[PDB]
Amino acid sequence: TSRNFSVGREGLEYVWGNHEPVRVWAQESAPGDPHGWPHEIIIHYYHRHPVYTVIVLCGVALAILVGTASSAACIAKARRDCLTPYALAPNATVPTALAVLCCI
Amino acid sequence: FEHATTVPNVPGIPYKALVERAGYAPLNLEITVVSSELTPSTNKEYVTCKFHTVIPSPQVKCCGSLECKASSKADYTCRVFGGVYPFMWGGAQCFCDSENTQLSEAYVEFAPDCTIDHAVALKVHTAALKVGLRIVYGNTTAHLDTFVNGVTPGSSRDLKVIAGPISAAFSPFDHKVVIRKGLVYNYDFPEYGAMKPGAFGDIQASSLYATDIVARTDIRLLKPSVKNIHVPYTQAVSGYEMWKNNSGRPLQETAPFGCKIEVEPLRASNCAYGHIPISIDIPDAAFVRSSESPTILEVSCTVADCIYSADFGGSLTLQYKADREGHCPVHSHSTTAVLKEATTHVTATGSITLHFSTSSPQANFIVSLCGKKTTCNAECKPPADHIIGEPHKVDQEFQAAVSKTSWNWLLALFGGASSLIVVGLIVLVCSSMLINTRR
Task: Give the integer Cα–Cα distance in Å for B339 and B367.
Answer: 9
- Across the interface, do B382 and A33 touch by the CB < 8 Å criterion? yes
Method: cryo-EM
d(CA B211, CA B208): 9
Cα Dmax for chain B: 138
Query: Count of CB contacts below 8 A, A vs B?
Result: 107
Contacts of B430 in chain A (CB under 8 A): 78
| Chain B contact for A33 (CB, 8 A cutoff) | yes
Residue B242 backbone zone (phi > 0: left; psi -120 to 50: alpha; other: beta) = alpha
| Residue A3 Cα, gap to closest chain B Cα (Å) | 16
Half-sphere exposure of B86 (CA within 13 A, CB side): 21
Q: Is B178 helix (H, G, I), strand (E, B) or coil?
A: strand
* Interchain contact A60–B (C-beta under 8 A): yes
**Which of B395, B411, B14 has the alpha carbon at shortest distance from A60?**
B411
Question: Under a CB-based contact definition with an 8 Å cutoff, are residues B281 and B146 in contact?
Answer: no
State whether A15 and B253 contact (CB < 8 Å). Answer: yes
Report the C-alpha gap between B427 and B439 in whole angstroms: 19
C-beta atoms of A70 and B424 within 8 A: yes
Inter-chain touch B431–A78, beta carbons under 8 Å: yes
Determine contact, residues B399/B316, Cβ cutoff 8 Å: no
Beta carbons of A71 and B385 less than 8 Å apart:
no
A63 contacts B361? CB cut-off 8 A: no
Reported residue count of chain A is 104
C-alpha distance from B171 to closest chain A C-alpha (Å): 18
Nearest CA in chain A to B272: A10
Cα A61 from Cα B413, distance rounded (Å):
9
Beta-bridge mates of residue B163: B278
| Element holding B6 (H helix, E strand) | strand B2-8
Chain B residue with minimal CA distance to A85? B435
A68 — contact with chain B (CB < 8 Å)? Answer: yes
CA distance B214 to B123: 19
Q: Which is nearest to B202 in space by CA: B187, B215, B188?
A: B215
Rounded CA-CA distance B326/B371 in Å is 14
Q: Using an 8 Å Cβ cutoff, are B34 and B26 in contact?
A: no
A71 at the B interface (CB within 8 A)? yes
Which amino acid makes up residue B411?
L
Residue A10 — left, alpha, or beta (φ > 0 → left; ψ -120 to 50 → alpha)?
alpha
